[PDB]
Design a protein around this ligand. Structure first.
Ligand SMILES: *[C@@H]1O[C@H](CO[C@H]2O[C@@H](C)[C@@H](O)[C@@H](O)[C@@H]2O)[C@@H](O[C@@H]2O[C@H](CO)[C@@H](O[C@@H]3O[C@H](CO)[C@@H](O)[C@H](O)[C@@H]3O)[C@H](O)[C@H]2NC(C)=O)[C@H](O)[C@H]1NC(C)=O
Ligand SMILES: OC[C@H]1O[C@@H](O)[C@@H](O)[C@@H](O)[C@@H]1O
Lengths: 197, 207
């Protein structure tokens, strides 16, 4: 039995409307489960579900503020097929947060030969790497997009690119598209950047 | 004892000039019984000796042993399977690992260059972007050059699985704002199995 601790979803810790959570994944035959120190009885929930095996995952609700402040979260198991318990722990990356720079980019000229085109959103200069990116069109969520994971830049900050694919006609008809970015160092943890021919 | 199988580098398989190889590594070899035998198979063949080449190395309280197998460019591009078998007197049973290029039909990458945003040109440095999409497998190499010389200040994202099963990525070249305004021509080089001579390039300039 090996234990893995996971951090909340970037977007979750950035909006009071949603719930950030730490997930403790215990993988793997063919059964038990502190934050900044302080012993027994939850803020948790867990469960036992199912290749051949167990995996008693436990989910804890974290306070948005508490996580952003760097508090530690310690997940201690307790099994009798293990010499000693496994206490994995995790916290938000350390260091001065840095505000993301957002830039939308039109499809390349050479691309306007295909029936679909690529709308690009460059997001650089941010720290920590936790961040959420989404697209919209006049108030409606675009589904066909992909974003690259964060990449460490030469100066200690991170970047990534988000790619929205849209029919060339929709881009020809002048529709406007927006790249939404959520990060802790953004005013109101949110900035939107628009794109259009 | 642990075994890890590493494939060759993207460019090694694409240029007959280079030497593509497969590296098998064993860590946590017992200090007492440090003897390790390697057996290599290319598509199940070759239990018997072939190229291969080990060494031996002592660490914290264990031994690390590396075996290197040179592969033929076309063998790798033709999907051949490479198996590394590691045996040790202190092992219940040998350990086997197999590697190859991903299964699927090669897809030619589409390479588009993108100038910096108008909104970024207010900074002392801008971003020249190169989009590489629609390729498979993900094994690929991307580089930048301005003239005949290599631009060193760039970062490439790792490939990302797109909606149609192909891969894409972006490489970002950072040049002083001044250079890009001076009309310098920059170039994105992409090397892949599905490209003509396993290569293509795209220019990016202000005009
Ligand atoms: C005994 O020591 C060796 C070597 O430890 C070195 O660690 C580095 C950081 C160096 O600064 C110094 O501290 C030591 O020389 C340990 O060997 C390591 O074993 C792990 C296996 O878990 C290897 O990890 C694997 O790495 C590859 C990529 O390289 C990944 O693809 C795998 O998924 C996996 O992460 C690691 O490469 C080994 N490091 C070296 C230098 O070979 C060894 O673990 C340690 N004793 C133990 C705990 O077994
Ligand atoms: O559950 C996720 C974890 O699963 C393990 O099997 C490994 O793949 C880890 O690298 C990973 O963090």
């Amino acid at each position: 039995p090996s234990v893995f601790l996971f951090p909340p979803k970037p977007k979750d810790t950035l909006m009071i409307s949603r719930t950030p959570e730490v997930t403790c994944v215990v993988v793997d035959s063919h059964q038990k489960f502190y934050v900044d120190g302080v012993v027994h009885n939850a803020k948790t929930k867990p469960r036992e579900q199912q290749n051949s095996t167990y995996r008693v995952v436990s989910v804890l609700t974290v306070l948005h503020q508490n996580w952003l402040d760097g508090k530690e979260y310690k997940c201690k198991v307790s099994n009798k097929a293990l010499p000693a318990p496994i206490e994995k722990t995790i916290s938000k990356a350390k260091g001065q947060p840095r505000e993301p720079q957002v830039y939308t980019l039109p499809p390349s000229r050479e691309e306007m030969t295909k029936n679909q085109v690529s709308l690009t959103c460059l997001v650089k200069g941010f720290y920590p790497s936790d961040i959420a990116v989404e697209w919209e069109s006049n108030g409606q969520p675009e589904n066909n997009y992909k974003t690259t994971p964060p990449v460490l830049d030469s100066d200690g900050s991170f970047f990534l690119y988000s790619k929205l694919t849209v029919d060339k006609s929709r881009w020809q008809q002048g529709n406007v598209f927006s790249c939404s970015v959520m990060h802790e160092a953004l005013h109101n943890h949110y900035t939107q950047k628009s794109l259009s021919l």
